[PDB]
């Protein structure tokens, strides 16, 4: 047997960032200045995004190594926060439209945007950790779902198939392909198992802004005309549900849970379209 439905816990104090680490412009403001930027980045931006991606990937790996029964989602946050700040990076989630921590921790039925808190991880849980780094004036965004102890076969299979769906989507990325192939591949694959692909939350262009206005759908919609072009940078971050798509948002305004409380899994990379294919920027 697995855990029953989650409830929100209490937050730890806001974690400090040394002043020499530049903040993204949106910290503490009600909105963010993003959504109207070009989608193909300059070479100088791309090189800085390889640095930001690798530091985010390090933070996600360190916190992922800590996922185990008995560890709280707040403890994960502490590890991601400390890794980012000790690398001179600002945690892009911290202060984004009031979000109060340095990564998102989404267990079980939480589709996305769970807030690290006093929740204790237990055996059987699946734990998504999503960390973004801001450094060099650019962002790098990556996430993965980690099993805690021995996870039930249907939950294990959902995690592993969601990882596969993400890899197959990444492997489609090539200049000249329609962006819509990403969702086509993910949804076709997911539907083989009777899973449902979340529609209202998507991937996104990323560069000097966190969500740059480019939207990357994870379901099939070939009416989107956008093509992949060298220099384009975006995330692929499918959330795939065992149950129905209907969801609710907790009173914190952030935590998104499945209404039927069936579990859901996600993985994410920041990608660069190169002249021949793809380069994963959030790579160790
Ligand atoms: C799933 O989550 C992604 C997400 O909300 N996409 C948006 C959902 C959406 C809906 C319509 C149009 C664009 C987009 C991009 C998001 O980009 C995460 O990967 C990121 O790490 C977290 C950001 C905070 C918690 C600070 C918000
Ligand atoms: Ni993310
Ligand atoms: Ni993202």
UniProtKB/Swiss-Prot annotation:
PROSITE patterns (alphabetical): MAP_1
EC category: hydrolase
Gene behind the chain: map
Catalytic reaction equation(s): Release of N-terminal amino acids, preferentially methionine, from peptides and arylamides
Name of the featured protein: Methionine aminopeptidase 2
HAMAP family, per the entry: MetAP_1 (MF_01974)
Gene3D superfamilies: Creatinase/methionine aminopeptidase superfamily (3.90.230.10)
One Pfam family linked to the record: Peptidase_M24
Cofactor details (free text): Binds 2 divalent metal cations per subunit. Has a high-affinity and a low affinity metal-binding site. The true nature of the physiological cofactor is under debate. The enzyme is active with cobalt, zinc, manganese or divalent iron ions. Most likely, methionine aminopeptidases function as mononuclear Fe(2+)-metalloproteases under physiological conditions, and the catalytically relevant metal-binding site has been assigned to the histidine-containing high-affinity site.
GO molecular function ontology, one term from the record: metalloaminopeptidase activity
Presence of the UniProt keyword Iron-sulfur in the record: no
Family note: Belongs to the peptidase M24A family. Methionine aminopeptidase type 1 subfamily.
Cofactor section: Co(2+); Zn(2+); Mn(2+); Fe(2+)
GO cellular component assignments: cytosol
EC number: 3.4.11.18
Binding site for a divalent metal cation 1: 130, 141, 268
Binding site for substrate: 113, 211
Subunit structure: Monomer.
């Amino acid at each position: 047997p697995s855990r029953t439905a989650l409830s929100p816990g209490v937050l730890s104090p806001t974690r400090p960032v040394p002043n020499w680490i530049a903040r993204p412009e949106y910290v503490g403001k009600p909105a963010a200045q993003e959504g109207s930027e070009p989608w193909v980045q300059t070479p100088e931006v791309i090189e800085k995004m390889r640095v930001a991606g690798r530091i985010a990937a390090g933070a996600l790996a360190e916190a992922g190594k800590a996922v185990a029964p008995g560890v709280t989602t707040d403890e994960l946050d502490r590890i991601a926060h400390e890794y980012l700040v000790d690398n001179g990076a600002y945690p892009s989630t911290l202060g984004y439209k009031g979000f109060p921590k340095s990564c998102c921790t989404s267990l079980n039925e939480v589709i996305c945007h769970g807030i690290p808190d006093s929740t204790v991880i237990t055996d059987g849980d699946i734990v998504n950790i999503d960390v973004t780094a801001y450094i060099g004036g650019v962002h790098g965004d990556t996430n993965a779902t980690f099993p805690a102890g021995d996870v039930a076969d249907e939950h294990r299979l959902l995690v592993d198939r969601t990882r596969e769906a993400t890899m197959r989507a990444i492997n489609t990325v090539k200049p000249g392909r329609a962006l819509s192939v990403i969702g086509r591949v993910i949804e076709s694959y997911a539907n083989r198992f009777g899973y449902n692909v979340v529609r209202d939350f998507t991937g996104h262009g990323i560069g000097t802004t966190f969500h740059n206005g480019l939207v990357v759908l994870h379901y099939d919609q070939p009416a989107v005309e956008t093509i992949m072009q060298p220099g384009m940078t975006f995330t692929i971050e499918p959330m795939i549900n065992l149950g129905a798509l209907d969801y609710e948002i907790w009173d914190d305004g952030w935590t998104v849970v499945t209404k039927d409380r069936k579990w859901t899994a996600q993985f994410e990379h920041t990608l660069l379209v190169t002249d021949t294919g793809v380069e994963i920027l959030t790579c160790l």
